[PDB]
Amino acid sequence: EFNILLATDSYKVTHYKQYPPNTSKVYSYFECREKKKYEETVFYGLQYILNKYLKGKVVTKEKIQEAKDVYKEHFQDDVFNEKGWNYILEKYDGHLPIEIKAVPEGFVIPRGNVLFTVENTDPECYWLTNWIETILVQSWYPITVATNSREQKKILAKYLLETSGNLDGLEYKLHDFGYRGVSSQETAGIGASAHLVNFKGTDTVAGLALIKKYYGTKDPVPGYSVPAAEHSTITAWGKDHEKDAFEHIVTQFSSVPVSVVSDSYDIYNACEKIWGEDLRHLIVSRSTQAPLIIRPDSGNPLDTVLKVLEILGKKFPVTENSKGYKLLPPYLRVIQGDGVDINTLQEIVEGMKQKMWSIENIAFGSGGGLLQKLTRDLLNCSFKCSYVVTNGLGINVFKDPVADPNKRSKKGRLSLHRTPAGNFVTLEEGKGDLEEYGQDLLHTVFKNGKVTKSYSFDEIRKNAQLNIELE
Amino acid sequence: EFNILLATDSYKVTHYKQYPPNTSKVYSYFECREKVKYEETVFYGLQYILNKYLKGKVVTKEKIQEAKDVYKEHFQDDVFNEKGWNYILEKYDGHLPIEIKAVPEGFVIPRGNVLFTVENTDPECYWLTNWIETILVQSWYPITVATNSREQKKILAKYLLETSGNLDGLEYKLHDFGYRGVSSQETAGIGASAHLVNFKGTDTVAGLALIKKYYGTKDPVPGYSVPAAEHSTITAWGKDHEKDAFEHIVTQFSSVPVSVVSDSYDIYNACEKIWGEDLRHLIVSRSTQAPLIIRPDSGNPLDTVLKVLEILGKKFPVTENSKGYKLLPPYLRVIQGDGVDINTLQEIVEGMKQKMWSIENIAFGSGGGLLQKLTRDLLNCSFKCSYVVTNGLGINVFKDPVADPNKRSKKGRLSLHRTPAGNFVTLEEGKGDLEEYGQDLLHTVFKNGKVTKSYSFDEIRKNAQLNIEL
Ligand SMILES: O=C(NCc1ccc(S(=O)(=O)c2cc(F)cc(F)c2)cc1)c1ccn2ccnc2c1
Ligand SMILES: O=C(NCc1ccc(S(=O)(=O)c2cc(F)cc(F)c2)cc1)c1ccn2ccnc2c1
């Protein structure tokens, strides 16, 4: 079973002895710190952590004993605060005396703004605020995936609109391939759910169950996929029987969309000789609701896509859209699912526009670039203490390193407001109490062991929408 | 609860209809594909996955039903293989008819060798081999962490031996700060355990429980930490009371080692004026077994370390060791726990050597660099099919992309052997049956729902050791 007394950085076990004496409150906030691009971030993932790890009776007699035995051997000493954890057990039946206020999930906030604040509601539990830092900071991950996935959506939207005149199929242009490329099972589900905030296509099944259990949707499932081949299902037929492999597969999925990887031996031979001549008759007869989706999987991403399109364009009836861009027949599409990140995605769609190919022809699949190749310093997600109460007097606290102004932190009690121009501003030093800036957009989502406010996955999707989508 | 029927890439659900008719055997392998850095890898983590996800009754009527309802909505169609999973449920009581062979955990294998293989034991379950590719491939992560952690140990070992003459304290030179920098709780456990294969210092508690549950050690715990301050335990005293904070903290932990972060306002001021003058008397009186460890946490890593060292060198009695390198008094040490990954680690220790500072003075903390900033293409961890049997005839299969020779896969039944010079070789096309390279080095570790071979964390530590240590 999960034990919250063991879900923290080791040194935090010794922190209760290090605060100023007569301290009755510790107030801390979380922010995607601003750096001297990712100028706005999608706040998502907190609700998952609250339900799975923080709510309810998280402290038992046995968990305190287990933690005591582990920490004694871990530190070679008895630094564990048994009294403090016992207090919570007896006074609150193991419920955390903590109040967490947070901006609504799905919200899109510029960098350098408070996203959530954490404080203790019992004077005896001043130490509890930064005890659960580690478990709350890990929300940087669904925030970063959702933010980075959305930024890619922006790029796709821009070029799809310029080359086709609309945004049809936009929410299916970036597919999640990264189930195998992530570090663990829990990570898979979390990351996949963050991607689904912006898109509808995924192969990471783990994210589906997370959303149903923790967020919920009106629709049965939030993510979809289609039948497809991998290299094993093709190579199993033997080197000399790739055509037999291909033919068999498209016949098995004649009435639904089907993707087939064609780069096992020679991507350019398959597209020109096999798809383009030998099995052309099985392709041109397909429905618009069930196209063949050719999948190159190696070589330079831009160069391979262009050459595949160049080949297919000469073997199939190509039309020109109203914007003047070349479009494949509705039964034939291409997916690039190898080596795709936010950087190469820009290079490909930009290169496609150069050669007058519409973005309608292409979908994208991203593995580790979408889910794994992300760190906490990308958005500088940080958790800092800003306000404490010692001897009944509250002081505004902050760090301000001489060698790095970028690591300076906010002072005092914080609040998030709309500016008169409709932008966001974080008020410091409790200045939000002057009520010059309207209502604080931070809401109590957790208090004294209960989840006090919840959002469905539908609300979150609406919040994280693009301006180009609203228009 | 975990459901193995929902623990795979979505398109794999459709693959059973895609193999050639009359396929009775699918045989697949896992390797860190070959491409001057990371020439060898540490095999670790597969045992965790076998015990948590693959062993015992993993199929139930409820799980089959649950998967059926999910996939019908997921594909907007019925493509799920209910009969196949029902066969396993009835015929084997939910145990997976799967044979997995593998190299011992902890083993250091050069790139491009078979690390493990997977094949179905029942003709009816040919599709099962690659169904579990996704859960098995995720072992890239403990492998990559273990490997990148060990490569950092090589660097530290090299420079510690050079500037001190021995390897004392090496297993405590790279500390794990990665708990908050990782993508989840589960990853934190797996990643931290992978680090503990090479070192002993960790702050990620979750790694200890994983080792105890899945590997076990002779000692009560495989990892250790010391009391330390964070930026909140210092700043809470107010900007005008940093000295008050320092004094309170080093007095609470006056007989045990303690680390104090000193860059909240001015790192160079805290070292020169606060540690070096005002509270100097509290430092010089400390036991050697309980040193103060100063921790900067900002600025250029190398520049900050050197300047901090030069300041303390003029405030405290510095000696010179038998190698000619400068050494702080035994009650005073430094830890750099910011911006540390394998590249900057190399830059710092080399920089210290040039300025005649011993590596004995310093230890390193790493967060995302150690546990998060890693992907699957770093060691090119891959899972591919190499052998199938259709119509009672074995076929050696492979991929060979015309545009990428590096993505070429191995052919046929594989085996791992010792060369006459004592190196590793992977034999293809069943050539291991010729018995010209001796015995196969892979062991059977999973058969028909049962873990058939395991390793203690101590044995894994022994196998992973550096040559210089041996
Ligand atoms: O091919 C894979 N999956 C199948 C697949 C096929 C097409 C599309 S699509 O985006 O074209 C698409 C989406 C969709 F929802 C409706 C639709 F009509 C068209 C997406 C996904 C796959 C999965 C994981 N991987 C890991 C490593 N490699 C892979 C490969
Ligand atoms: O300071 C942190 N932890 C405390 C700490 C301090 C010093 C050493 S040590 O390597 O000096 C050491 C090790 C040991 F086992 C014996 C010993 F004597 C000396 C190790 C650990 C810490 C933890 C997580 N973080 C995340 C972000 N930042 C942090 C910081």
mmCIF file of N, CA and C in Angstrom, chain A residues 177-259:
data_model
loop_
_atom_site.group_PDB
_atom_site.id
_atom_site.type_symbol
_atom_site.label_atom_id
_atom_site.label_comp_id
_atom_site.label_asym_id
_atom_site.label_seq_id
_atom_site.Cartn_x
_atom_site.Cartn_y
_atom_site.Cartn_z
ATOM 1 N N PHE A 177 2.120 7.855 -29.279
ATOM 2 C CA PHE A 177 2.788 6.579 -29.539
ATOM 3 C C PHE A 177 3.680 6.140 -28.377
ATOM 4 N N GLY A 178 3.759 6.961 -27.336
ATOM 5 C CA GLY A 178 4.814 6.823 -26.345
ATOM 6 C C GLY A 178 4.591 5.946 -25.130
ATOM 7 N N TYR A 179 3.711 4.956 -25.236
ATOM 8 C CA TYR A 179 3.470 4.041 -24.124
ATOM 9 C C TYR A 179 4.762 3.308 -23.735
ATOM 10 N N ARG A 180 5.490 2.814 -24.732
ATOM 11 C CA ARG A 180 6.693 2.028 -24.479
ATOM 12 C C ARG A 180 7.902 2.908 -24.168
ATOM 13 N N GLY A 181 7.824 4.177 -24.558
ATOM 14 C CA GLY A 181 8.949 5.084 -24.436
ATOM 15 C C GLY A 181 9.003 5.854 -23.131
ATOM 16 N N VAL A 182 8.056 5.591 -22.234
ATOM 17 C CA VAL A 182 8.040 6.267 -20.938
ATOM 18 C C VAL A 182 8.684 5.411 -19.859
ATOM 19 N N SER A 183 8.807 5.978 -18.665
ATOM 20 C CA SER A 183 9.573 5.354 -17.593
ATOM 21 C C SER A 183 8.796 4.304 -16.799
ATOM 22 N N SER A 184 7.478 4.468 -16.703
ATOM 23 C CA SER A 184 6.659 3.525 -15.944
ATOM 24 C C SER A 184 5.198 3.507 -16.383
ATOM 25 N N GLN A 185 4.415 2.638 -15.750
ATOM 26 C CA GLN A 185 3.003 2.476 -16.082
ATOM 27 C C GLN A 185 2.168 3.669 -15.633
ATOM 28 N N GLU A 186 2.431 4.144 -14.420
ATOM 29 C CA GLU A 186 1.713 5.289 -13.877
ATOM 30 C C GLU A 186 1.994 6.525 -14.722
ATOM 31 N N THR A 187 3.256 6.684 -15.110
ATOM 32 C CA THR A 187 3.678 7.792 -15.961
ATOM 33 C C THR A 187 2.954 7.768 -17.302
ATOM 34 N N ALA A 188 2.798 6.570 -17.858
ATOM 35 C CA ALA A 188 2.094 6.387 -19.121
ATOM 36 C C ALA A 188 0.683 6.955 -19.057
ATOM 37 N N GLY A 189 -0.072 6.541 -18.045
ATOM 38 C CA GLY A 189 -1.440 6.989 -17.874
ATOM 39 C C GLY A 189 -1.551 8.486 -17.667
ATOM 40 N N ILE A 190 -0.676 9.032 -16.824
ATOM 41 C CA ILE A 190 -0.671 10.462 -16.530
ATOM 42 C C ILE A 190 -0.343 11.293 -17.766
ATOM 43 N N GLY A 191 0.738 10.928 -18.448
ATOM 44 C CA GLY A 191 1.167 11.638 -19.639
ATOM 45 C C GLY A 191 0.155 11.545 -20.764
ATOM 46 N N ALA A 192 -0.445 10.369 -20.919
ATOM 47 C CA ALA A 192 -1.432 10.153 -21.970
ATOM 48 C C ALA A 192 -2.675 10.996 -21.727
ATOM 49 N N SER A 193 -3.030 11.173 -20.459
ATOM 50 C CA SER A 193 -4.186 11.986 -20.097
ATOM 51 C C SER A 193 -3.925 13.468 -20.354
ATOM 52 N N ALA A 194 -2.679 13.891 -20.167
ATOM 53 C CA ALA A 194 -2.302 15.280 -20.412
ATOM 54 C C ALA A 194 -2.367 15.607 -21.903
ATOM 55 N N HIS A 195 -1.989 14.639 -22.726
ATOM 56 C CA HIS A 195 -2.064 14.795 -24.171
ATOM 57 C C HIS A 195 -3.521 14.882 -24.638
ATOM 58 N N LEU A 196 -4.394 14.124 -23.985
ATOM 59 C CA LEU A 196 -5.798 14.056 -24.372
ATOM 60 C C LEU A 196 -6.561 15.341 -24.054
ATOM 61 N N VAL A 197 -5.916 16.247 -23.326
ATOM 62 C CA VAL A 197 -6.484 17.564 -23.066
ATOM 63 C C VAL A 197 -6.575 18.347 -24.376
ATOM 64 N N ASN A 198 -5.625 18.090 -25.270
ATOM 65 C CA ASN A 198 -5.520 18.826 -26.522
ATOM 66 C C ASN A 198 -5.924 18.012 -27.753
ATOM 67 N N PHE A 199 -5.685 16.705 -27.715
ATOM 68 C CA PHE A 199 -5.977 15.844 -28.857
ATOM 69 C C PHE A 199 -6.875 14.669 -28.476
ATOM 70 N N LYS A 200 -7.319 13.916 -29.477
ATOM 71 C CA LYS A 200 -8.254 12.814 -29.259
ATOM 72 C C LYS A 200 -7.675 11.445 -29.612
ATOM 73 N N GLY A 201 -6.484 11.430 -30.198
ATOM 74 C CA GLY A 201 -5.867 10.184 -30.615
ATOM 75 C C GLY A 201 -4.769 9.709 -29.682
ATOM 76 N N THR A 202 -4.843 8.443 -29.285
ATOM 77 C CA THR A 202 -3.837 7.858 -28.406
ATOM 78 C C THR A 202 -3.818 6.333 -28.503
ATOM 79 N N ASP A 203 -2.643 5.748 -28.291
ATOM 80 C CA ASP A 203 -2.508 4.297 -28.225
ATOM 81 C C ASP A 203 -2.159 3.847 -26.811
ATOM 82 N N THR A 204 -1.835 4.812 -25.957
ATOM 83 C CA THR A 204 -1.554 4.533 -24.558
ATOM 84 C C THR A 204 -2.871 4.354 -23.819
ATOM 85 N N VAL A 205 -3.299 3.102 -23.688
ATOM 86 C CA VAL A 205 -4.591 2.765 -23.094
ATOM 87 C C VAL A 205 -4.697 3.209 -21.636
ATOM 88 N N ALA A 206 -3.554 3.264 -20.959
ATOM 89 C CA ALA A 206 -3.496 3.604 -19.538
ATOM 90 C C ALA A 206 -4.149 4.949 -19.213
ATOM 91 N N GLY A 207 -4.031 5.905 -20.129
ATOM 92 C CA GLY A 207 -4.604 7.223 -19.932
ATOM 93 C C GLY A 207 -6.123 7.240 -19.921
ATOM 94 N N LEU A 208 -6.741 6.271 -20.590
ATOM 95 C CA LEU A 208 -8.198 6.200 -20.657
ATOM 96 C C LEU A 208 -8.816 5.924 -19.291
ATOM 97 N N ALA A 209 -8.246 4.961 -18.573
ATOM 98 C CA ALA A 209 -8.779 4.551 -17.279
ATOM 99 C C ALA A 209 -8.545 5.612 -16.210
ATOM 100 N N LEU A 210 -7.467 6.375 -16.363
ATOM 101 C CA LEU A 210 -7.149 7.438 -15.418
ATOM 102 C C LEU A 210 -8.219 8.525 -15.501
ATOM 103 N N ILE A 211 -8.619 8.851 -16.723
ATOM 104 C CA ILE A 211 -9.593 9.908 -16.948
ATOM 105 C C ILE A 211 -10.976 9.521 -16.435
ATOM 106 N N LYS A 212 -11.373 8.277 -16.682
ATOM 107 C CA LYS A 212 -12.666 7.789 -16.218
ATOM 108 C C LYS A 212 -12.735 7.755 -14.690
ATOM 109 N N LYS A 213 -11.639 7.349 -14.058
ATOM 110 C CA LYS A 213 -11.598 7.208 -12.605
ATOM 111 C C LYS A 213 -11.427 8.534 -11.863
ATOM 112 N N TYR A 214 -10.716 9.479 -12.469
ATOM 113 C CA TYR A 214 -10.359 10.708 -11.763
ATOM 114 C C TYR A 214 -10.995 11.987 -12.307
ATOM 115 N N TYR A 215 -11.490 11.950 -13.539
ATOM 116 C CA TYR A 215 -12.028 13.160 -14.157
ATOM 117 C C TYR A 215 -13.416 12.970 -14.764
ATOM 118 N N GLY A 216 -13.570 11.941 -15.589
ATOM 119 C CA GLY A 216 -14.861 11.613 -16.166
ATOM 120 C C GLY A 216 -15.203 12.404 -17.413
ATOM 121 N N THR A 217 -15.863 11.742 -18.357
ATOM 122 C CA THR A 217 -16.319 12.382 -19.584
ATOM 123 C C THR A 217 -17.736 11.936 -19.926
ATOM 124 N N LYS A 218 -18.461 12.781 -20.656
ATOM 125 C CA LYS A 218 -19.793 12.435 -21.140
ATOM 126 C C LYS A 218 -19.704 11.257 -22.101
ATOM 127 N N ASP A 219 -18.743 11.327 -23.015
ATOM 128 C CA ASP A 219 -18.483 10.242 -23.950
ATOM 129 C C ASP A 219 -17.904 9.045 -23.203
ATOM 130 N N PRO A 220 -18.138 7.828 -23.721
ATOM 131 C CA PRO A 220 -17.620 6.603 -23.099
ATOM 132 C C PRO A 220 -16.105 6.636 -22.901
ATOM 133 N N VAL A 221 -15.363 7.027 -23.935
ATOM 134 C CA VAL A 221 -13.909 7.160 -23.835
ATOM 135 C C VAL A 221 -13.427 8.488 -24.429
ATOM 136 N N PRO A 222 -12.342 9.045 -23.867
ATOM 137 C CA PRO A 222 -11.791 10.324 -24.329
ATOM 138 C C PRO A 222 -10.811 10.181 -25.491
ATOM 139 N N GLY A 223 -10.308 8.972 -25.722
ATOM 140 C CA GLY A 223 -9.316 8.754 -26.759
ATOM 141 C C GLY A 223 -9.648 7.607 -27.691
ATOM 142 N N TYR A 224 -9.177 7.708 -28.932
ATOM 143 C CA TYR A 224 -9.465 6.703 -29.944
ATOM 144 C C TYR A 224 -8.220 6.274 -30.712
ATOM 145 N N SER A 225 -8.341 5.165 -31.433
ATOM 146 C CA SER A 225 -7.277 4.684 -32.300
ATOM 147 C C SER A 225 -7.871 3.859 -33.435
ATOM 148 N N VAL A 226 -7.017 3.403 -34.344
ATOM 149 C CA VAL A 226 -7.455 2.581 -35.463
ATOM 150 C C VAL A 226 -6.549 1.361 -35.583
ATOM 151 N N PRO A 227 -7.031 0.301 -36.257
ATOM 152 C CA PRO A 227 -6.181 -0.867 -36.510
ATOM 153 C C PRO A 227 -4.936 -0.497 -37.305
ATOM 154 N N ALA A 228 -3.819 -1.146 -36.996
ATOM 155 C CA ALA A 228 -2.584 -0.895 -37.722
ATOM 156 C C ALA A 228 -1.587 -2.031 -37.566
ATOM 157 N N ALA A 229 -0.544 -1.998 -38.387
ATOM 158 C CA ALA A 229 0.499 -3.010 -38.346
ATOM 159 C C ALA A 229 1.753 -2.495 -37.654
ATOM 160 N N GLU A 230 2.549 -3.422 -37.136
ATOM 161 C CA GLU A 230 3.899 -3.116 -36.691
ATOM 162 C C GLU A 230 4.845 -3.922 -37.565
ATOM 163 N N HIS A 231 6.147 -3.772 -37.346
ATOM 164 C CA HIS A 231 7.129 -4.454 -38.181
ATOM 165 C C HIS A 231 7.044 -5.971 -38.057
ATOM 166 N N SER A 232 6.691 -6.457 -36.874
ATOM 167 C CA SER A 232 6.622 -7.893 -36.652
ATOM 168 C C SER A 232 5.524 -8.562 -37.476
ATOM 169 N N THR A 233 4.360 -7.924 -37.571
ATOM 170 C CA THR A 233 3.245 -8.498 -38.325
ATOM 171 C C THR A 233 3.527 -8.504 -39.826
ATOM 172 N N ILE A 234 4.468 -7.671 -40.260
ATOM 173 C CA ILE A 234 4.884 -7.648 -41.660
ATOM 174 C C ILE A 234 6.059 -8.598 -41.913
ATOM 175 N N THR A 235 7.103 -8.491 -41.094
ATOM 176 C CA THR A 235 8.308 -9.296 -41.293
ATOM 177 C C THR A 235 8.075 -10.793 -41.063
ATOM 178 N N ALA A 236 7.050 -11.131 -40.285
ATOM 179 C CA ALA A 236 6.728 -12.530 -39.999
ATOM 180 C C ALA A 236 6.397 -13.311 -41.268
ATOM 181 N N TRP A 237 5.924 -12.604 -42.290
ATOM 182 C CA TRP A 237 5.597 -13.222 -43.571
ATOM 183 C C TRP A 237 6.851 -13.606 -44.354
ATOM 184 N N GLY A 238 7.999 -13.084 -43.929
ATOM 185 C CA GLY A 238 9.247 -13.326 -44.630
ATOM 186 C C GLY A 238 9.573 -12.219 -45.618
ATOM 187 N N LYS A 239 10.867 -11.997 -45.835
ATOM 188 C CA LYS A 239 11.362 -10.919 -46.693
ATOM 189 C C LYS A 239 10.731 -10.893 -48.088
ATOM 190 N N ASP A 240 10.463 -12.069 -48.648
ATOM 191 C CA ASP A 240 9.958 -12.155 -50.014
ATOM 192 C C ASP A 240 8.446 -11.964 -50.108
ATOM 193 N N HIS A 241 7.781 -11.850 -48.964
ATOM 194 C CA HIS A 241 6.323 -11.793 -48.950
ATOM 195 C C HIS A 241 5.769 -10.556 -48.254
ATOM 196 N N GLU A 242 6.322 -9.395 -48.583
ATOM 197 C CA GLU A 242 5.836 -8.145 -48.021
ATOM 198 C C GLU A 242 4.498 -7.784 -48.662
ATOM 199 N N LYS A 243 4.367 -8.078 -49.952
ATOM 200 C CA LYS A 243 3.133 -7.804 -50.676
ATOM 201 C C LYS A 243 1.996 -8.662 -50.138
ATOM 202 N N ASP A 244 2.300 -9.921 -49.836
ATOM 203 C CA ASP A 244 1.320 -10.815 -49.236
ATOM 204 C C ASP A 244 0.922 -10.298 -47.862
ATOM 205 N N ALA A 245 1.906 -9.789 -47.125
ATOM 206 C CA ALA A 245 1.661 -9.205 -45.814
ATOM 207 C C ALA A 245 0.730 -8.010 -45.934
ATOM 208 N N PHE A 246 1.075 -7.084 -46.828
ATOM 209 C CA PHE A 246 0.291 -5.869 -47.040
ATOM 210 C C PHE A 246 -1.143 -6.191 -47.453
ATOM 211 N N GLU A 247 -1.273 -7.015 -48.490
ATOM 212 C CA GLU A 247 -2.569 -7.372 -49.058
ATOM 213 C C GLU A 247 -3.500 -7.993 -48.022
ATOM 214 N N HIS A 248 -2.959 -8.913 -47.234
ATOM 215 C CA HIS A 248 -3.722 -9.602 -46.203
ATOM 216 C C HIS A 248 -4.285 -8.632 -45.174
ATOM 217 N N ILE A 249 -3.482 -7.636 -44.810
ATOM 218 C CA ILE A 249 -3.845 -6.699 -43.752
ATOM 219 C C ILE A 249 -4.933 -5.714 -44.171
ATOM 220 N N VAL A 250 -4.803 -5.144 -45.365
ATOM 221 C CA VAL A 250 -5.802 -4.196 -45.854
ATOM 222 C C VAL A 250 -7.137 -4.882 -46.148
ATOM 223 N N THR A 251 -7.091 -6.181 -46.426
ATOM 224 C CA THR A 251 -8.310 -6.949 -46.659
ATOM 225 C C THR A 251 -9.009 -7.264 -45.334
ATOM 226 N N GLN A 252 -8.218 -7.472 -44.286
ATOM 227 C CA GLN A 252 -8.756 -7.708 -42.950
ATOM 228 C C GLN A 252 -9.430 -6.459 -42.392
ATOM 229 N N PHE A 253 -8.926 -5.294 -42.782
ATOM 230 C CA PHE A 253 -9.494 -4.031 -42.330
ATOM 231 C C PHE A 253 -9.922 -3.191 -43.526
ATOM 232 N N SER A 254 -10.784 -3.772 -44.353
ATOM 233 C CA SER A 254 -11.224 -3.134 -45.586
ATOM 234 C C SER A 254 -12.217 -2.001 -45.350
ATOM 235 N N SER A 255 -12.886 -2.018 -44.200
ATOM 236 C CA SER A 255 -13.964 -1.066 -43.943
ATOM 237 C C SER A 255 -13.666 -0.057 -42.833
ATOM 238 N N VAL A 256 -12.473 -0.132 -42.254
ATOM 239 C CA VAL A 256 -12.053 0.836 -41.243
ATOM 240 C C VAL A 256 -10.697 1.422 -41.633
ATOM 241 N N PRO A 257 -10.345 2.595 -41.078
ATOM 242 C CA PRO A 257 -9.008 3.136 -41.339
ATOM 243 C C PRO A 257 -7.925 2.145 -40.920
ATOM 244 N N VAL A 258 -6.895 2.010 -41.744
ATOM 245 C CA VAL A 258 -5.815 1.084 -41.441
ATOM 246 C C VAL A 258 -4.459 1.697 -41.773
ATOM 247 N N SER A 259 -3.567 1.695 -40.791
ATOM 248 C CA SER A 259 -2.214 2.177 -41.003
ATOM 249 C C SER A 259 -1.276 0.998 -41.180
#
